[PDB]
């Protein structure tokens, strides 16, 4: 299928003492492969997947330098934004940044992203054409005019369409044994007698990869959303994901209900029924 590489960056100012907390994570599809935490002792970009350890010391030295440079940019941005919004030095504030690229199943470039938030709200983001900017307010409009004059978009575009795609491909090849394997959901249904007249059917999808999945309930072959509950897809902790969907049904009518599971790892959707 298609693939993506994404980097997430969070920086939280610490007014009482010292510099902002900075945390960077890198992810190929739903696999975290690098991290940097300014509170950690290494002060290094660290591997989080076996296949990235194939990279030599020049890789770790250069990514460490660059992620520290990223952290300094976020540090001075927190200061710039404090002034743009006329905020005091007493308060803690947050910047968040995500960027990366998508490629299709042919590994050709699909889509690039670069978006930035301040205190949990959109600030500025590169448009899908990778040429113009979306500025949410007049502070971000000042940044937009500055970045337009310096042609920042052209630099980011060269990376998003070029460097990013080439290295995503290299990672996908080095990590083929996991990055290019799909893990279909392991499914089962459980039954819970709520009261004397109602029961809950819970349809489980376990140990799947990647995270994208669809669970639906049908009654007599028609989609049902009333009296259902779907939890957020959640990490198992071993690199796979979990989800469940439940429906409340009249006791004795369980057989009218089917759970339908769609996932990239399945040749065709699965249907589960309580019998």
């Amino acid at each position: 299928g298609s693939h993506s590489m994404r980097y997430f960056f969070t920086s939280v100012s610490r007014p009482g003492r010292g510099e902002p907390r900075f945390i960077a994570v890198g992810y190929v599809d739903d696999t975290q492969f690098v991290r940097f935490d300014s509170d950690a002792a290494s002060q290094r970009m660290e591997p989080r997947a076996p296949w990235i350890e194939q990279e030599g010391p020049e890789y770790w030295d250069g990514e460490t330098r660059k992620v520290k440079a990223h952290s300094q940019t976020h540090r001075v941005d927190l200061g710039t934004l404090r002034g743009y919004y006329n905020q005091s030095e007493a308060g803690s504030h947050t910047v968040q940044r995500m960027y990366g690229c998508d490629v299709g199943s042919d590994w050709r470039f699909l889509r690039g992203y670069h978006q930035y938030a301040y205190d949990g709200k959109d600030y500025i983001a590169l448009k899908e054409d990778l040429r113009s900017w979306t500025a949410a307010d007049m502070a971000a409009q000042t940044t937009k005019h500055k970045w337009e004059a310096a042609h920042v978009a052209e630099q980011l575009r060269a990376y998003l369409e070029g460097t990013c795609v080439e290295w995503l491909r290299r990672y996908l090849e080095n990590g083929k044994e996991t990055l290019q394997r799909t893990d279909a959901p392991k499914t089962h249904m459980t039954h819970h007698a709520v009261s004397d007249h109602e029961a809950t059917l819970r349809c489980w999808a376990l140990s799947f990869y990647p995270a994208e999945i669809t669970l639906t309930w049908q009654r007599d072959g028609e989609d049902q959303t009333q009296d259902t509950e779907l939890v957020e897809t959640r990490p198992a902790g071993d690199g796979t994901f979990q989800k469940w969907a439940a429906v409340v049904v009249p006791s004795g009518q369980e057989q009218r209900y089917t759970c339908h599971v769609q996932h990239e790892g399945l040749p065709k959707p699965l249907t589960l029924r309580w019998e």
Partner: peptide
């Protein structure tokens, strides 16, 4: 692989 340059606001 990270961006080589991250321009400040």
């Amino acid at each position: 692989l990270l961006l080589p340059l991250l321009p400040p606001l």
